[PDB]
Structure 1
Amino acid sequence: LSDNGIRYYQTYNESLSLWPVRCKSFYISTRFGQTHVIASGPEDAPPLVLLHGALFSSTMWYPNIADWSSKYRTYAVDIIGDKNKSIPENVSGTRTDYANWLLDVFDNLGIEKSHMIGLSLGGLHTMNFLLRMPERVKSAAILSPAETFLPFHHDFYKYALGLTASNGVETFLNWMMNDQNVLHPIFVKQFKAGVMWQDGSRNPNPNADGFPYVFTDEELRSARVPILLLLGEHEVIYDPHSALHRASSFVPDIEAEVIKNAGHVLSMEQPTYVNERVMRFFN
């Protein structure tokens, strides 16, 4: 770990101070590297897996974990290769690799079947997984997924490219959060330290067979596990209504909605609503 990486790890730990319940941080071994997991909830309760949005880490679930972990043994898994505490190894970058990584996580956590919640990148990993390992998923809540139904609008790339510039994180977040005062300052400090940390592990080369990815009509038609799709009305990475329409056109028996007064990071903007909505779906 470099000095920027040490500093990022520090900010991550401070961000856990926001976690309103007791949790345990630990590493699990996989074929693609040591994977960080935060576990919460009763040991004997049914399992729930959380996969975070890009660059945000597992720490982002602080406004949701008190409600979700009351009933489920919840595992917030740091996505291998993204900006967080997981340490990737031998990742070619294919959708198959990422699916196998998560399978190793389920396997090492003792999970047979589980409920899943993914936001942004985690939403894309969730769709990928349920399509490949359907017998391991009870049902899945996909929230503002990265691509999946529609390609990224070029605005996303324009703002993302300016992240690593003076005032780039503020600019990026203001665009994504619709200029709303939502994120706790401590978490923002972590997000920024992640952005500053650029000498860590290498990214896999861009790959048509990796992520981000838009599923074909026939791939969407093949979904076999129940899905809840939540999008925000103020989503900026693609048009939310168009995404819902494409999802509804092909994913059989989907439950889906565009949430008023929320955008992309809807789990942090409208936790009370989102917390109950997802729980209602899992029941």
Structure 2
Amino acid sequence: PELSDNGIRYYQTYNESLSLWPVRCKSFYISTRFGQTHVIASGPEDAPPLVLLHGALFSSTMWYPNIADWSSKYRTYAVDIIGDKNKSIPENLSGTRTDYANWLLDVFDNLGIEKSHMIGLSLGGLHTMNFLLRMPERVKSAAILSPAETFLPFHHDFYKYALGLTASNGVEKFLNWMMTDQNVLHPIFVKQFQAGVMWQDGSRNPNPKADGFPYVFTDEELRSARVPILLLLGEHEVIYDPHSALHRASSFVPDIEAEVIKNAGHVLSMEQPAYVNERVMRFFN
């Protein structure tokens, strides 16, 4: 082992956030070609598989408002995205979109998944789109929530608030910007998010490059989608214009159900869990 003091603190906060999980779960690691990947499993072992991919910097622990509902019907695996601030441990990771799809391939294979439902928010939504485009044979259908780029490039403010996280009151600035009411987030969850931001001496993040993430799919790439997609966006979205995003997605993706949700922004799964929970279920059913 070799975690810094800040790393140990982050791990402790992650474990404390897992107490917000209102159903029985197990934490475990899956070996992939790009390193040990942390997974939280909930739901009946014989139920259809569902894979969750969290938003940037938030980890799999963010699914606490949704997991009781989704877990009732699905064998639900919350996967920590390799290279992001969480419990997954990256090895030899270049950061290309090919690499990331192959990482997720390994996760699927190692969980014994043939086809799966997928839900991804923010960064996880981008991973989801990248995966379903490359490997439609493995995805039954996908719910893409407030995706990182994918349809539109970020507004420049996203870069600024994300960068500002480590300086002075950056965490508070980021959350007040992104959320009309950041008090919808549990204080224990926020403590973890803060500890993540303070943990800076761990794995080095791959420098953003043209062949990596974030990414905006071309017109032709979007037209090529062969998996049903539910796209949920929040009216109060700040990372881009959510109506502009819906317009582009709806213009090109063949099999899409897209909507801009009321009284929610970027982290719509946490702001409107009652609506979002049912809406996703209805789509999968």
TM-score between both structures, scaled by the size of structure 1: 0.99
Superposition deviation, residue 179 in structure 1 = 3.8
Paired with 1:73 and 1:261, the residues of 2 have a C-alpha distance of 30
Matched position secondary structure for 1:29: strand
Cα deviations across residues 59-95 of structure 1 (Å, max 9, x unaligned)?
0000000000000000000000000000000111100
Stretches of structure 1 that go unaligned for 5 or more consecutive residues are none
Paired with 2:221 and 2:128, the residues of 1 have a C-alpha distance of 14
Residue correspondence of structure 1 range 37-116 to structure 2 within 5 A? 37-116=39-118
Superposition deviation, residue 202 in structure 1 = 1.3
Superposition deviation, residue 203 in structure 1 = 1.4
Paired with 1:205 and 1:244, the residues of 2 have a C-alpha distance of 29
Cα deviations across residues 35-72 of structure 1 (Å, max 9, x unaligned)?
00000000000000000000000000000000000000
**Range with greater deviation from structure 2 (200-209 or 68-77):** 200-209
Paired with 2:139 and 2:32, the residues of 1 have a C-alpha distance of 19
Matched pairs, number: 283
Stretches of structure 2 that go unaligned for 5 or more consecutive residues are none
User: Among the aligned pairs, what percent are the same residue?
Assistant: 98
Paired with 1:11 and 1:138, the residues of 2 have a C-alpha distance of 34
Cα deviations across residues 256-283 of structure 1 (Å, max 9, x unaligned)?
0000100000000000000000000000
Superposition deviation, residue 178 in structure 1 = 2.1
Paired with 1:166 and 1:183, the residues of 2 have a C-alpha distance of 21
**Are residues 1:9 and 2:11 paired?**
yes
- The question of whether the paired residues in 1 share the 8 Å contact of 2:53 and 2:81 is answered with yes
Paired with 2:178 and 2:68, the residues of 1 have a C-alpha distance of 25
Matched position secondary structure for 1:59: helix
Match of 1:170 in 2: 172
Matched position secondary structure for 1:220: helix
Paired with 1:180 and 1:44, the residues of 2 have a C-alpha distance of 37
- The question of whether the paired residues in 1 share the 8 Å contact of 2:22 and 2:64 is answered with yes
Superposition deviation, residue 166 in structure 1 = 1.9
Matched position secondary structure for 2:143: strand
Paired with 1:80 and 1:278, the residues of 2 have a C-alpha distance of 25
Paired with 1:200 and 1:161, the residues of 2 have a C-alpha distance of 17
2:158 to 151, 156, 159: 156
Matched position secondary structure for 1:188: helix
Matched position secondary structure for 2:226: coil
- The question of whether the paired residues in 1 share the 8 Å contact of 2:38 and 2:80 is answered with yes
TM-score between both structures, scaled by the size of structure 2: 0.98
Cα deviations across residues 113-157 of structure 1 (Å, max 9, x unaligned)?
000000000000000000001100000000000000000001111
Cα deviations across residues 200-251 of structure 1 (Å, max 9, x unaligned)?
1111222100000000000000000000000000000000000000000000
Superposition deviation, residue 161 in structure 1 = 1.5
Superposition deviation, residue 180 in structure 1 = 4.2
Q: For the aligned residues, what is the CA RMSD?
A: 0.6
Paired with 2:183 and 2:90, the residues of 1 have a C-alpha distance of 34
